[PDB]
Symmetry: C3
Amino acid sequence: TGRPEWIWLALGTALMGLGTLYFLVKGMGVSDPDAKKFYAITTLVPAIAFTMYLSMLLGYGLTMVPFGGEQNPIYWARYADWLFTTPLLLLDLALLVDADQGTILALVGADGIMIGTGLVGALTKVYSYRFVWWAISTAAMLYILYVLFFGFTSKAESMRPEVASTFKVLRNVTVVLWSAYPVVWLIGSEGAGIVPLNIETLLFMVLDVSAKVGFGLILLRSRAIFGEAE
Amino acid sequence: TGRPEWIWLALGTALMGLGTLYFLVKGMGVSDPDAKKFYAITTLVPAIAFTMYLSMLLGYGLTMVPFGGEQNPIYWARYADWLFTTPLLLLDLALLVDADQGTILALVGADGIMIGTGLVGALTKVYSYRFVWWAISTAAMLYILYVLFFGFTSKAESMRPEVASTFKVLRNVTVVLWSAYPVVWLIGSEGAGIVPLNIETLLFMVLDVSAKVGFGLILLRSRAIFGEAE
Amino acid sequence: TGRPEWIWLALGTALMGLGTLYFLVKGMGVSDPDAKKFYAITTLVPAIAFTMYLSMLLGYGLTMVPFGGEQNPIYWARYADWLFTTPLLLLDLALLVDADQGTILALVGADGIMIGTGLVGALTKVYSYRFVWWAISTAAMLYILYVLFFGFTSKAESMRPEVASTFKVLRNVTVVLWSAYPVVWLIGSEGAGIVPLNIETLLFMVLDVSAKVGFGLILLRSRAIFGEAE
Ligand SMILES: CCCCCCCC/C=C/CCCCCCCC(=O)OC[C@H](O)CO
Ligand SMILES: CCCCCCCC/C=C/CCCCCCCC(=O)OC[C@H](O)CO
Ligand SMILES: CCCCCCCC/C=C/CCCCCCCC(=O)OC[C@H](O)CO
Ligand SMILES: CCCCCCCC/C=C\CCCCCCCC(=O)OC[C@H](O)CO
Ligand SMILES: CCCCCCCC/C=C\CCCCCCCC(=O)OC[C@H](O)CO
Ligand SMILES: CCCCCCCC/C=C\CCCCCCCC(=O)OC[C@H](O)CO
Ligand SMILES: CCCCCCCC/C=C\CCCCCCCC(=O)OC[C@H](O)CO
Ligand SMILES: CCCCCCCC/C=C\CCCCCCCC(=O)OC[C@H](O)CO
Ligand SMILES: CCCCCCCC/C=C\CCCCCCCC(=O)OC[C@H](O)CO
Ligand SMILES: CCCCCCCC/C=C\CCCCCCCC(=O)OC[C@H](O)CO
Ligand SMILES: CCCCCCCC/C=C\CCCCCCCC(=O)OC[C@H](O)CO
Ligand SMILES: CCCCCCCC/C=C\CCCCCCCC(=O)OC[C@H](O)CO
Ligand SMILES: *C/C=C(C)/C=C/C=C(C)/C=C/C1=C(C)CCCC1(C)C
Ligand SMILES: *C/C=C(C)/C=C/C=C(C)/C=C/C1=C(C)CCCC1(C)C
Ligand SMILES: *C/C=C(C)/C=C/C=C(C)/C=C/C1=C(C)CCCC1(C)C
């Protein structure tokens, strides 16, 4: 296709589809009701991302937004994907540590604010205001990272050791990979425009696959997704 | 009005409103907390559909999509309706058989993918890609039908006989009526264009009323929506 | 800015942000899992409203709708806010009285219909049909007010006295403040156009702050959000 970033869109589509199929086959026959929840959540994540990468590849998930005196290609389908997948990923972590309901709602709600204000910033036509929305979205992300570190890490250690070990790995993966997102947005085509769109698409593709399929490979091999039973 | 399909839009509006009012009156005074859930879910279904049929009748729920070198009328409000009503209908069936939480999330999530990719296909301006989205949506539907047949039918029979009997009827109604949807889309105005819009609207109106009000009449007369009590 | 209503948008933004920060600090260290739910729900409400007032202030949340032969400024972001905040506020009340699940779903679903049909009415280009949607939305509101009065008031009194006392106050605040919304819409710029936009914005700002921050100040000072414990 005529968009140089097409190659990373095609690769992302393929890797999300492959991950979906792997998790779907691996989940076959699992009967433990706890493991069933984790397989359900964790297979839905790359299946959603598959459909939204495909929409970017085929050009449906792309729009033009006028700012800085130019017509800037903005892939809006990223936010339609992240609105559903990022809370599912926090639900995997919260169910692992058996978080209380109030904390789960705070996490999902702040996550909604993070994605929603990112979309508004991506579509805003006054250049300087784009970064106002970026800051509010980044502040919601910091709230989430704080809860994951100074709320979840304390319940985990009071839990099954294999639960504590798998949570600490997935938490560390989550904090590292999620913190890169606001940086890429800020220096790429949605923000300051220093990194061109084709490289930004590569970077997001590496992050998206790692945070969904990589995350899922660590979780679904773990013993912590099963009840303790004889 | 000047659209020949208006007559089926008006009839669908009337029948969804009548069904809503019937279920609402029938549910009055019910105090069993289990029956309350089923009345809540099952009355909300035609009330949503009422509002979205009304929006198609009045022309709000209609847009023009250019493909095949023509401006094609696409009723987008069908997908805004189905996004909310189809998971509610699966929730009626899953609560009947007391499905586990993981399975419920898999069903609702695949249902979301089915409707979401149907909307993308309905709005896509490259003709051949419309059928790519149709295929992905149909594959999510098959996943749902498989779960309903080779997961739910096995828990039901281990349940109350009246639960097993009412589930098997509603399952059979669900599988038959839901399988017709991808066929109508494919041969009507969203797809190959063999059946004209006014007949497609009739067919959908027959399906929508049967799958919501007919489904609801069978369920809410049943004894399975009540706890077993003296 | 050049819109005379800007001053009430700026004041609303400031008061929602201040309320969010107050509730967030006040909630720090709370460990009771019940109180955690109420703090979670009640802090998310003004945080959402903050982001949507900011979008109206900066002009993102505004669109032009042609009706009555004019281009009418319609702030659509009000409905994106209310779609999420109004069910959260009903969830605060329902958890207080420990409502059954069926009733909670009926409330949230009717609330969804109320906001959804209000948005359709706000965006409808045939003037007389705007009031059809207003009537359907008002009928869903009456259903909600009826449940709050002839379902919730009866469970409350069978509960902890401090639960019964705090619910009755918050119910009365809710019924009074929520009933004003359909009146303002009808006589302001979305409806008959008797009250100009800058005054309508003031009225909504007074209502929104009272129904969210005022509501939240009454609830989160109360003893009813905590479990009874020694
Ligand atoms: C897991 C095993 C695989 C590991 C792989 C990890 C890759 C992740 C990072 C990629 C950034 C690549 C950056 C490529 C930059 C090229 C941009 C370019 O062409 O810059 C010149 C410009 O045209 C004028 O200055
Ligand atoms: C419950 C009791 C009621 C039962 C009712 C069940 C009806 C369901 C099916 C309807 C399809 C009707 C198809 C009508 C086809 C007419 C199309 C037509 O005019 O075709 C000629 C065309 O103009 C040139 O070939
Ligand atoms: C909590 C302590 C503070 C209490 C505060 C409560 C205020 C709520 C009501 C405000 C309505 C104000 C209405 C202002 C009307 C002025 C409109 C105007 O200018 O009308 C003349 C017009 O130009 C030609 O007739
Ligand atoms: C000027 C001030 C502007 C306003 C600030 C920016 C608003 C958006 C940013 C972050 C969301 C903050 C988190 C919202 C959710 C709070 C959750 C909560 O309070 O949870 C308590 C519970 O006890 C825990 O387990
Ligand atoms: C427990 C549930 C908690 C739920 C928490 C959710 C938080 C979402 C809050 C704010 C973002 C709203 C973003 C809305 C952006 C809409 C953009 C859009 O549709 O734009 C259309 C068009 O391009 C221009 O009019
Ligand atoms: C825990 C994770 C926290 C995540 C949040 C971290 C945000 C701040 C980081 C970097 C901003 C660096 C400055 C970027 C702005 C550069 C502006 C500019 O014009 O730069 C010129 C350019 O370098 C040549 O042309
Ligand atoms: C090329 C490959 C493309 C990718 C395939 C097409 C994607 C969309 C289609 C179907 C959704 C499939 C179902 C998604 C949800 C899976 C649920 C699950 O795994 O549930 C396990 C649980 O144990 C059960 O009770
Ligand atoms: C447990 C929760 C699970 C939730 C599972 C949800 C699955 C949805 C996934 C993909 C479809 C996304 C479809 C998005 C289509 C948007 C179309 C649109 O708004 O188009 C606007 C405009 O016409 C053009 O830019
Ligand atoms: C369990 C339910 C499964 C649901 C999924 C079943 C999908 C396949 C079924 C029918 C496709 C039949 C072929 C349709 C394509 C016809 C193309 C065409 O141009 O036909 C010419 C026309 O007949 C004259 O002009
Ligand atoms: C012409 C007739 C048109 C149709 C009427 C207007 C439709 C929209 C208005 C109101 C929603 C009504 C409430 C919908 C939800 C009903 C909930 C229910 O039935 O709940 C039973 C449960 O037992 C309780 O706890
Ligand atoms: C338990 C869950 C229950 C959930 C209950 C939800 C009830 C919502 C029902 C109907 C309103 C639908 C309103 C849809 C309005 C869309 C307006 C829009 O997006 O318009 C785009 C554009 O301006 C023009 O095409
Ligand atoms: C419990 C809460 C219930 C909430 C629902 C209550 C709705 C009815 C109330 C008021 C309508 C009054 C009539 C408004 C219509 C006036 C039309 C008009 O043109 O008025 C001329 C104007 O007064 C000079 O120019
Ligand atoms: C599957 C992909 C994942 C894990 C998505 C993560 C997304 C974020 C952490 C995005 C955050 C953003 C900000 C904090 C600033 C504004 C732009 C966003 C939405 C990219
Ligand atoms: C109330 C109406 C009901 C039960 C709606 C059912 C809808 C479907 C089963 C739709 C499925 C579709 C496909 C599987 C292919 C693409 C087009 C759709 C969305 C009609
Ligand atoms: C935070 C703000 C609150 C509590 C919002 C309340 C909103 C309503 C009660 C709105 C109801 C409406 C109608 C009943 C008629 C049509 C217009 C609406 C949506 C304003």
